[PDB]
C-alpha cells in the first residue's frame with residue numbers, strides 16, 4: 440500500500456508518528472519504534488525537533504540486524520528545523536540528523552515549518568523579554584538548498600510541512616525550480632479536513648500527509664484543553680459501532696480513502712497494532728460524506744506568539 444511520489448519514489452500510505460513530549464523517557468521512542476516495525480509500520484516520521492532521531496534510528500538499525508526488514512523496506516522522514524532555514528545551514532542540519540540516526544540517507548526531508556527562527560543552539564531561542572526570536576528567510580533559497588540535498592543523495596525525496604496554498608505556490612512558481620515538493624505535511628482530521636488545500640495539492644501532484652489525524656496529543660503548551668476531543672465525536676463513534684472498529688480506525692481510514700497519506704502516533708503496543716488494521720475495512724461513500732460534514736476549521740495547535748509570524752500558515 441504505497442503512493443508514487445512525483446519524483447518516482449514510493450511512500451507507504453500509513454506512517455508511524457514518533458513525537459512524544461519531553462516527560463516521556465527517550466528510551467520509549469526506541470522501544471515503540473521497534474513495536475511499530477514489528478506491527479507492520481514501514482513509514483516512520485521523525486524530525487530534529489523531536490529529540491529522538493538517535494532512538495528511532497537505533498530501532499531501525501536493530502530491526503534490520505535481526506532480519507525483520509531491510510533498509511530499503513523502511514521509509515524514514517526527517518525534517519529541517521526552523522532555526523536552520525538559512526541555505527548554508529540546510530545540509531549540515533541534514534548531515535547531523537543522519538549522523539544521529541546512523542543512517543546514510545533519509546527517504547524524505549521536509550522543511551518542518553515556514554516560520555523561520557533565529558539560527559542558534561536552542562530550538563526556540565528567546566529574547567530578553569522571553570519572546571521566541573523570528574528570522575526572515577526567503578524560503579525559495581531554503582528550498583534550493585533542499586534540492587541540493589536530494590542531488591547529494593542525502594534525501595531521496597524532499598517536501599514541506601505546515602505550508603498553506605500561497606506558500607506552496609511560491610515554491611512551485613520559483614524561477615528555475617528543479618524539484619517540486621513531493622508532499623505537504625499538515626494538520627488534517629475530520630475537524631479540519633483541509634479539503635481545499637487537498638484539492639490544490641492533488642492538482643499539482645503533491646501528496647497531502649495528515650498529522651494529528653487522531654485529534655493530536657492535546658499538549659497543554661499548544662492545545663486548548665477545552666477543544667473538542669476528536670475521538671469522542673458522536674458521528675465518528677456511531678461509525679465505529681457500525682463497522683465494529685474504533686473511532687481511531689474510522690479517522691485513519693477516512694484519510695486513506697480521500698487519497699491522503701496518514702500518520703498515527705502511539706506509544707502503546709496494542710494501539711500501535713490496532714492502527715495497522717486500517718487496511719482491513721472500507722468506509723462507504725456515504726460514510727465519507729458524513730465525515731466531510733464534521734469540518735469545523737479547527738486546528739488543535741495554537742500559538743498567540745507565532746500567530747504574528749509573517750509566515751504563519753493559518754492567515
Ligand SMILES: NC(=O)c1ccc[n+]([C@@H]2O[C@H](COP(=O)([O-])OP(=O)(O)OC[C@H]3O[C@@H](n4cnc5c(N)ncnc54)[C@H](OP(=O)(O)O)[C@@H]3O)[C@@H](O)[C@H]2O)c1
Nearest residue numbers: 456457458650651652653654655656687703704705706707
Ligand atoms: N509537521 C508537524 O508540524 C507535525 C505536527 C504534529 C505531528 N506531526 C507528526 O504526526 C504524528 C502524529 O500526530 P500527533 O502527534 O499530533 O498524534 P496523533 O496521531 O493525532 O495521535 C494522538 C493520540 O492518539 C492516541 N492514539 C493512537 N492510536 C490510537 C487508537 N487506535 N485508539 C485510541 N487512541 C489512539 C495516542 O495516544 P497513545 O500514545 O497513548 O496510543 C496519541 O497521543 C506526530 O507524532 C509527528 O510525527 C507533525
Ligand SMILES: O=C(O)c1cccc(Nc2ccc([N+](=O)[O-])c3ccccc23)c1
Nearest residue numbers: 488551552553554562563601741742745
Ligand atoms: O522548543 C521546543 O522544545 C519545542 C518543542 C516542540 C515544539 C515546539 N514548537 C513548535 C514546533 C513546530 C512548529 N511548527 O510550525 O512546525 C511550531 C509552531 C508554532 C509554535 C511552536 C512550534 C518547540
Ligand SMILES: O=C(O)c1cccc(Nc2ccc([N+](=O)[O-])c3ccccc23)c1
Nearest residue numbers: 458486488601626661740741742745752
Ligand atoms: O512536529 C510535531 O510533532 C510537533 C510537536 C509539537 C508541536 C508542534 N507544533 C506546531 C506545529 C505546527 C503548527 N502550525 O502552525 O502548523 C503549530 C502552530 C502552533 C503551535 C504549534 C504548532 C509540532
